[PDB]
């Protein structure tokens, strides 16, 4: 089958099966060795059995899903924190149906903010500093104001 | 000088991708082991 890069796909390189994102690598392999492993003995690079091109294997995006809620007694509005992922990857996985949680938060614009803890959807980022009410991470906190 | 550790790295475990990793049969078999996943997740959240 044809080669697809920069996309989470199920690959099979001469019996080596797995899932991940294939990208162009700068690793200079030797002619006899085919696939590479890191210190933890996980496959991080392979060669094309036909093109002989070295491709980096990056695992597909995953992480924890955290829900920020002011409490049922206050409101039913919630914010979702996709931990450890860029907002662009979440937008791509929402535009095309690839994200595991079937529910999707409505991106109304200016409500998708990128934090160092992950992508925050459902809350707007203000420039005013307040006391931390709901700890999100990396110095960012949420509140219902 | 006096150096004292204050905190350590906060770690989270999926408890399913580690044991199974996108395997449905493995997940169905792990569902029969009880709430060990929940206990591990709760302990890690408490540590964090």
């Amino acid at each position: 089958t044809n080669l697809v890069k920069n996309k989470c796909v199920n690959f099979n390189f001469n019996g080596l099966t797995g899932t991940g994102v294939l990208t162009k690598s700068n690793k200079k392999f030797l002619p006899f060795q085919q696939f590479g492993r890191d210190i933890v003995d996980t496959t991080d690079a392979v060669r094309d059995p036909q093109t002989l091109e070295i491709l980096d294997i990056t695992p597909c995006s995953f992480g924890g899903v955290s829900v920020i809620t002011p409490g049922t007694n206050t409101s039913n509005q919630v914010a979702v924190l996709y931990q450890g992922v860029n907002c662009t990857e979440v937008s791509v996985a929402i535009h095309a149906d690839q994200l595991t949680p079937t529910w999707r938060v409505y991106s109304t614009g200016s409500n998708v903010f990128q934090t160092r803890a992950g992508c925050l959807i459902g809350a707007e980022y203000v420039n005013n500093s307040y006391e931390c009410d709901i700890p999100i991470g990396a110095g960012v906190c949420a509140s219902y104001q | 000088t006096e150096i004292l550790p204050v905190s350590m790295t906060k770690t989270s475990v999926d408890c399913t991708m580690y044991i199974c990793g996108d395997s449905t049969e493995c997940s169905n078999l792990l569902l029969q082991y009880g709430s060990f996943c929940t206990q591990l997740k709760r302990a890690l959240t408490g540590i964090a």
């Binding site: 931990q83 803890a117 700890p135 110095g139 | 475990v13």
Partner: peptide, 21 residues
């Protein structure tokens, strides 16, 4: 000097609440 001296299958590292700053 202290900052300069002190130098993935389901395992996620959570960032601290308070940043170094």
């Amino acid at each position: 000097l202290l900052f300069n001296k002190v130098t993935f299958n389901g395992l996620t590292v959570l960032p601290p609440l308070l940043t170094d700053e």
